[PDB]
Design a protein around this ligand. Structure first.
Ligand SMILES: Nc1ncnc2c1ncn2[C@@H]1O[C@H](COP(=O)(O)CP(=O)(O)OP(=O)(O)O)[C@@H](O)[C@H]1O
Ligand SMILES: Nc1ncnc2c1ncn2[C@@H]1O[C@H](COP(=O)(O)CP(=O)(O)OP(=O)(O)O)[C@@H](O)[C@H]1O
Ligand SMILES: [Zn+2]
Ligand SMILES: [Zn+2]
Lengths: 339, 336
């Protein structure tokens, strides 16, 4: 039963002791003696070693070594030796350190991604960015859904498209560009525009729908109603001008749905104002939303960490430093998924 | 003279009264009478109108109209009509308008700017393409590394058939395909010592995402303070996306301002030298996106970059954003 120090752990001289690890799992250990001991025991696991083989080379008392071993193990700084049983030349090897760092076997996450099927409903700015992440991360099957054609104004956010692509179907060029990046996956396209609730029946079953299409105004309400009735997982992502939005991620029976937590003259005026609405699109906002959405899809399917947007619609601001989550937990009294 | 309603304005009935605006400027107006008066005033500007003309068009008293007009005007829900002006960058125009800038003037500032991309990996790929398609006039790409198959997970400009080619080379080609209106430049360089930074050209700003050695950004900091050179750092610490600081000579603190045993150190240095980040495209892309937002804003001058005086971290396994103060230090070791 070998263990090996993760390649993603770093330690630093800091404060009265030091830091162990990098990122979300970073620990500040205030006691210098303990921290120095943690370093000494980590060093013993640089090569793949059983507990007792590493202990043999440690110059500290067994009880101190044992405590440090446990610390390292619980945070996945040391990982089973087999979790490093893949070639450095594997195209997905960088994601592997990421999987390892959450205590998962990267070969098993990869196999889950390989066998998954994802629907990209909406192939604009969000769909462009989500689809390449999912494609190059090894999701086995991607189905691109969109009826629109590429324009010159798309080139701002829609990173797969070029000047030369103007006039072609979006789904056509994305497929071309996805397969140029990862030819070991399968990519299909459906030419569909969702005019009515009934149109959603032409969208295929999948592990998850990535929904970024936002026309008409109640498209999401149709998608949610449909997915509740079809028992189909979906995630929403987009933006409200300068705020990046992703979530909720809907899982049948395991999470709340979109609807759970929800003068004629002026009424005419509101409607006209809203009819003329066009979002202040901004690539960085689009990209943040799409990045975090894809992370939640990879985690939903990989199963190695909890998706952020379970039971939540998450907003990330671009002009102030702010995240806010909006409660979208299950309501027993919901008219869509309820009693 | 003339004022027009922004297309990015959204309006909903909510609770007591309603909401005016979408996104960061979204405002709850409790007073329903004031809420209705706002929409009555806004409605007269859907089609461009002068102050006085809209007053005679609205069915509300001159005092209520002045209040609602100022409300819309200060929040940039209504803008000067000339700002309204199909275009390549027409999409970004609503963004600049929403912050009370003339898009044409912002667009011009971008057209006249030079950006250095110091590091053409994951962060470089994504930063450079946002900048190119937003219309930064000159982009200088700097890297001495070749494309590998393992790059394709997050280095979005690169395909399988590009493996073995130079990064600067392929980024340039792909940038030019997406925006032919700009000029792209490459330099084959790797920063081996602090003294190699003199070979980096003068720009409006440096995007620093190079991450070898550990002390690269420390070198970059000291040089940029010396060269009077604006720079912004961006990257990640495993699962945490990082951007900032944005160093502006004479305005902000530098990277080293707030500074935010034989047997042991030998083992530390051996462990640390084996380090490899747990890279993850989503984390790459957030850092790069928010960094690119700060560059556009710094150069476009229409909003304050978020990372002035701050190193910002966005968590990926938690809903969390945290900021470290990098304000000016008089007793700093590099500047001050
Ligand atoms: N009902 C629908 N059925 C199929 N596709 C739709 C759709 N509504 C929108 N889409 C597609 O989904 C993408 C996003 O659409 P919307 O966000 O509603 C307006 P947009 O600003 O054109 O999005 P974009 O910026 O992502 O292109 C577009 O490519 C569009 O073609
Ligand atoms: N001193 C230096 N001078 C110039 N460029 C540098 C540099 N150090 C690093 N870089 C460049 O900055 C980029 C950083 O790339 P990243 O995507 O952050 C990690 P990577 O090393 O590309 O991934 P890998 O570990 O899978 O190879 C690389 O393209 C690298 O060539
Ligand atoms: Zn419900
Ligand atoms: Zn300083």
């Amino acid at each position: 039963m070998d263990y090996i120090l993760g390649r993603y752990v770093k330690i630093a001289r800091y404060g009265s002791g030091g830091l162990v690890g990098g990122g979300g799992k970073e620990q500040y250990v205030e006691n210098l003696v303990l921290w120095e001991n943690i370093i000494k025991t980590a060093y013993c696991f640089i090569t793949p070693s059983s507990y007792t083989a590493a202990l043999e080379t440690a110059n500290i008392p067994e009880k101190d070594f044992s405590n440090c071993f446990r610390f390292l193990k619980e945070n996945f700084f040391i990982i089973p030796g087999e979790y490093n049983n893949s070639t450095e030349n594997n195209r997905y090897s960088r994601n592997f350190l990421h999987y390892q760092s959450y205590g998962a076997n990267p070969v098993l996450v990869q196999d889950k991604l390989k066998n998954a099927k994802v629907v990209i409903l909406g192939c604009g700015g969000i769909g462009n960015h989500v689809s390449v992440i999912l494609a190059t991360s090894g999701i086995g099957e991607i189905i691109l859904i969109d009826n629109d054609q590429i324009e010159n104004t798309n080139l701002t956010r829609q990173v797969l498209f070029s000047e030369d692509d103007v006039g072609k179907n979006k789904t056509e060029v994305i497929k071309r560009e996805l397969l140029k990046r990862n030819s070991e996956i399968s990519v299909s396209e459906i030419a569909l525009n969702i005019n009515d609730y009934t149109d959603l029946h032409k969208v295929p079953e999948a592990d998850i729908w990535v929904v970024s299409a936002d026309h008409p105004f109640n498209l999401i309400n149709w998608v949610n109603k449909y997915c509740v009735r079809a028992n189909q997982p979906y995630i929403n992502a987009g933006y409200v001008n300068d705020i990046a939005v992703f979530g909720p991620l809907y899982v049948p029976g395991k999470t709340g749905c979109y609807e759970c937590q929800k003068k004629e003259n002026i009424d005419h005026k509101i409607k006209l104002i809203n009819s003329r609405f066009k979002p202040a699109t901004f690539a960085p906002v689009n990209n943040v939303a799409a990045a975090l959405c894809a992370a939640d899809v990879i985690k939903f399917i990989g199963k190695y960490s909890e998706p952020l947007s379970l039971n939540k619609r998450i907003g990330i601001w671009s002009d102030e430093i702010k995240i806010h989550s909006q409660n979208m937990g299950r309501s027993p009294v919901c008219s869509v998924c309820g009693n």
